[PDB]
Design a protein around this ligand. Structure first.
Ligand SMILES: *[C@@H]1O[C@H](CO)[C@@H](O)[C@H](O)[C@H]1NC(C)=O
Lengths: 50, 49
């Protein structure tokens, strides 16, 4: 919570889990990806979205 | 969204609608307009209205 509150990311939306609830749940071995894309593609990453 | 969004929160049910229109020649000051203020931090969420 406090992490993304300060960072002020422009694009942020979470699927299948609420961002406010994220502090409560417990996971196993969270992954993290990272790359750089063109502007249009930033509005083009989503599950089942061609 | 951001805390500015969380300052004005609509109910889950809402009858009516919003109207938004551009304002570049009146609300923009060449020397810098700073009369508008927004909220960036708060204790918790807000009830609708
Ligand atoms: C960049 O990394 C530093 C590491 O000390 C961090 O403090 C800062 O918040 C980061 N900037 C962001 C997340 O915008």
């Amino acid at each position: 919570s406090v992490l993304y509150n300060s960072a002020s990311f422009s694009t942020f939306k979470c699927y299948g889990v609420s961002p406010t609830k994220l502090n409560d749940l417990c996971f196993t071995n969270v992954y993290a990806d990272s790359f750089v894309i063109r502007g249009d593609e930033v509005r083009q990453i989503a599950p089942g979205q061609t | 969204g951001k805390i500015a969004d969380y300052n004005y929160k609509l109910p889950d049910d809402f009858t009516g609608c919003v109207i938004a229109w551009n304002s570049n020649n009146l609300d923009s000051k060449v020397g810098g307009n700073y009369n508008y203020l927004y909220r960036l931090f708060r204790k918790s969420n807000l009830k609708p209205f």
